[PDB]
Symmetry: C2
Subunit: 192 residues, 2 copies
């Protein structure tokens, strides 16, 4: 009855903080393209929504753009979670779950999302749950300490997500921990 239900192979979700080495980790699977459906985070979609860079606007003016940005993230995630494939294995960077439990909940906490906007997103999440199939068979948590994550971010000659405070990575770290450690199967890796 749910959309995409029974159309998806064994699926693995790569979860981790900003700067936990997810892009790096996923580069290793690229030789296996032909047997593995391999979906990196759709940052490029977020940067170019018919010309508008949602990601930037979100980092620039969070109180105006958090709602639209997260709405869109959620869409692009669903678009991945549901994309048809012939391959026997599917691997995604992040998921609708990280969006809901980490990033959105964090924007609510530090006050960038007003309660009214948050609730709108949350009613959607509830409705998505009932109407779309999001296949999820195993999560690989690339665990790290906020401090180690900060390093990388700044090492990387880089761009958007680039300009985040440590307190923010701390807050995100804790949310990932609440979701992944303190309570499908979770495989924790030390990415230090």
């Amino acid at each position: 009855t749910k959309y995409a239900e029974g159309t998806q192979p064994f699926t693995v979700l790569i979860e981790g903080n900003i700067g936990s080495g997810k892009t790096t980790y996923l580069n290793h699977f690229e030789k296996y393209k032909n047997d593995i459906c391999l979906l990196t985070e759709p940052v490029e979609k977020w940067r170019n929504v018919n010309g508008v860079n949602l990601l930037e606007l979100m980092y620039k003016d969070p109180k105006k753009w958090a709602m639209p940005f997260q709405s869109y993230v959620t869409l692009t995630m669903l678009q991945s979670h549901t994309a048809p494939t012939n391959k026997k294995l599917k691997i995604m960077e992040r998921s609708i779950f990280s969006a809901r439990y980490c990033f959105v909940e964090n924007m609510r906490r530090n006050g960038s999302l007003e309660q009214g906007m948050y609730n709108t997103l949350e009613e959607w999440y509830k409705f998505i749950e009932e109407s779309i199939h999001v296949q999820a068979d195993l999560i690989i948590y690339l665990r790290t300490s906020p401090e180690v994550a900060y390093e990388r971010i700044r090492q990387r000659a880089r761009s958007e997500e680039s300009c985040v405070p440590l307190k923010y990575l701390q807050e995100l770290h804790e949310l990932h921990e609440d979701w992944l450690i303190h309570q499908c199967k979770v495989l924790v890796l030390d990415a230090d």
Copy 2:
């Protein structure tokens, strides 16, 4: 393959401008409750989103709340469009289509929705189209002139849409007309026009 696909009976959508007499029209069908699934516009949901009145915030500060508001409307409409029922006939006040083609498009035009937010809603609409079955068998257009509607609005008790200016009702009228008469928009399903004078 789409959600709710083949779970829905013959569906009628009541479209019309603000103040076109939809609420009045739909009161006539209330004696038939037992045979007819009857879904009025979920304004009460929009007024109480865990305490927050999106509808008000939207009319007070459109540039901040248009995006969240419409996103929510779209959700509630889908909730109606897909709600299970045993009845042989389903009747909705407005639809996801009026939301997309009239109200959202109008908020883009008068600049309350930024291009960026508009685009987000639009990408959703496209994805909704592909994944969630929206049953629609006949639309009943309660057609009126902006002036008659503006007047009907003025006679009623106050809150919310009351201070919608006539120019706004004009803009909305034309968008409904484009959609349901001039048929400038991608819709299938017969249209039955009624003179709501």
